[PDB]
Amino acid sequence: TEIEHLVQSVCKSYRETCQLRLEDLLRQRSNIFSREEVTGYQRKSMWEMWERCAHHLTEAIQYVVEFAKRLSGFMELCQNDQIVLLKAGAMEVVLVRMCRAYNADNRTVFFEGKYGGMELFRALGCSELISSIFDFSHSLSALHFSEDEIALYTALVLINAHRPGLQEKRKVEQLQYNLELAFHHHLHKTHRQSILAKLPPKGKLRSLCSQHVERLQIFQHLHPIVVQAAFPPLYKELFS
Ligand SMILES: CC(C)=CCC[C@@H](C)[C@H]1CC[C@H]2[C@@H]3CC=C4C[C@@H](O)CC[C@]4(C)[C@H]3CC[C@]12C
Ligand SMILES: Cc1cc2c(s1)c(-c1ccc(C(=O)O)cc1)nn2C(=O)c1c(Cl)cccc1Cl
């Protein structure tokens, strides 16, 4: 069916843009920052940690932009709608992708080549927001997302006809309905429909991610970093 091909193309787009390989991430779980290395990060200036973390986060976004660009029918949307969907959803996808890099056993994340806890980031002074991000990954870790499940769920995070400001809402609805069918179909074929009831509630991802982006906007205002835009019109609604 056109649906099994849509499943295959979404998984392919994901596989090509997932940035880090699951085998690598799982294999390096034992490669953990030492007390001294942690202290090294904690003593850095707020502004150097910000530069590092901002560069890594914009690179994560760019992989999500390529994921979207390779999604069947994503380019056939009007550029306004491309921007609206990426502007509402790209960071939500990055926060979802974090669960693959996150180890629930010791509440660590993969960062510059090893695993560390949220205290790595103490110099940024965002204790409560970073803790929220870690908690969200802790929740998503319990689902043991397969790669294809992550691919199909993140596709649906982006392709959402409820985002305000769409010019061709019906064209987005058609992608969304197809991806919904692809996702349900896949879950049925793998006996994993049970994850549907365990998915994060939409307002949760939305309000966590809008706080995150709001804090990044504030740091970017106090201490601008500069990046070579992959999607210039989209860069402009965030680097404006
Ligand atoms: C609040 C603030 C100013 C910063 C947030 C600090 C911290 C929570 C950020 C900084 C770098 C991020 C990772 C970057 C890259 C990836 C790879 C992606 O494929 C999956 C996600 C992941 C691992 C990001 C996770 C969140 C990190 C650690
Ligand atoms: C939903 C989205 C939020 C968000 C996006 S999209 C982008 C972004 C990045 C690059 C490109 C591109 O074209 O290369 C396009 C978009 N940055 N960003 C941020 O929150 C952000 C980051 Cl990650 C770092 C520093 C400052 C900020 Cl404000």
Swiss-Prot record:
Name this protein carries in UniProt: Nuclear receptor ROR-gamma
Entry keyword Nucleus: yes
Any one Gene Ontology molecular-function term assigned to this protein's record: zinc ion binding
Tissue: Isoform 1 is widely expressed in many tissues, including liver and adipose, and highly expressed in skeletal muscle. Isoform 2 is primarily expressed in immature thymocytes.
Organism: Homo sapiens
Motif (AF-2) on chain: 234-239
Subunit structure: Interacts (via AF-2 motif) with the coactivator NCOA2 (via LXXLL motif). Interacts with the corepressor NCOR1. Interacts with CRY1. Interacts (via AF-2 motif) with the coactivators NCOA1 and PPARGC1A (via LXXLL motif). Interacts (via AF-2 motif) with PROX1. Interacts with FOXP3. Interacts with NR0B2.
Biological process annotations from GO: adipose tissue development; cellular response to sterol; circadian regulation of gene expression; lymph node development; negative regulation of thymocyte apoptotic process; negative regulation of transcription by RNA polymerase II; Peyer's patch development; positive regulation of circadian rhythm
